[PDB]
Amino acid sequence: PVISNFCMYEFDNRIHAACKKVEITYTRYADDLTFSSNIPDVLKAVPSTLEVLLKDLFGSALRLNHSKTVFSSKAHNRHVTGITINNEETLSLGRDRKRFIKHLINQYKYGLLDNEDKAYLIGLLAFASHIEPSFITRMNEKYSLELMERLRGQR
DNA sequence: GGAAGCGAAAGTGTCGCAACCCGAGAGAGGAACGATCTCGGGTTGCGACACTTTCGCAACCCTTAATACGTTC
């Protein structure tokens, strides 16, 4: 991981410098170049810049995945490295995952959830609390506070 | 990267069919010699197709991993 991060330091620096001028923010989770902006029709030229910079730096060793270049807007689904971005411009787990978690908690309510699924639900709830703290409050309201407290356990 | 099988893709040879040629022959006419149409090989050109070569998909995962629960690369 650290070698991979260092080998892309110059690429990250040059891409960030180019993107800040055109009001584009750039992040990379070591394989996922994410570019976003509020200016329309500004992200069209980003892939060409990426290709020319990669050819300048790494030659033919590192290449973009052209089948993995996706344009998205508020008209469609928007998720970055697993976190859905809402039309309200806030982080979310996605409606489908939230309904799955709700079903898991409902199954735990009637005692139809086994130990493996219970541990999976506890891990998912911790991840949700990290990502969507308001979802925990909503589940506390919907499924009562005592049920949630017994599900997460006590120290 | 690439077993083992197998099939795609492209190139090359081959082989049968058509088209024609050329000599032999029975004998039309009409009064003889041999016109004319056919029989039997033989040659050549051509194109469909079989055969030949190369490439590429992707087993396994090497001695050599860790094992609370969840996302991400």
Nucleotide nearest to A79 (CA to C1'): B72
Instruction: Tell me the technique behind this structure.
Output: cryo-EM
Length of chain A: 155
Of A13, A15, A3, A20, the C-alpha closest to A52 is: A15
C-alpha torsion sign, points A57, A20, A26, A46: negative
A58 CA to B39 C1' in angstroms comes to 82
Strand order in the sheet with A91-92: A79-80, A83-85, A91-92
Break chain A down into helix, strand, coil percent, rounded to 5.
Answer: 55, 10, 35
Q: Give the integer Cα–Cα distance in Å for A97 and A77.
A: 14
Q: Give the integer Cα–Cα distance in Å for A49 and A29.
A: 19
Which residues are CB-neighbours of A92 under 8 A, at least 6 positions away?
Answer: A83, A84, A85, A86, A98, A131, A132
Which residues are CB-neighbours of A26 under 8 A, at least 6 positions away?
Answer: A12, A15, A16, A19, A33, A34, A35
Q: For chain A, state the CA radius of gyration.
A: 21
Spell out which residues of A between 70 and 89 contact strand B, using CB within 7 Å.
81-82
Q: 3-class SS at A85?
A: strand
Q: Give the integer Cα–Cα distance in Å for A144 and A155.
A: 20
Say which DSSP state A22 is in.
T
Nucleotide nearest to A30 (CA to C1'): B73
Nucleotide nearest to A117 (CA to C1'): B69
Nucleotide nearest to A93 (CA to C1'): B71
Q: Give the integer Cα–Cα distance in Å for A149 and A99.
A: 20
Spell out which residues of A between 83 and 142 contact strand B, using CB within 7 Å.
119-120, 122-124, 126-127, 130
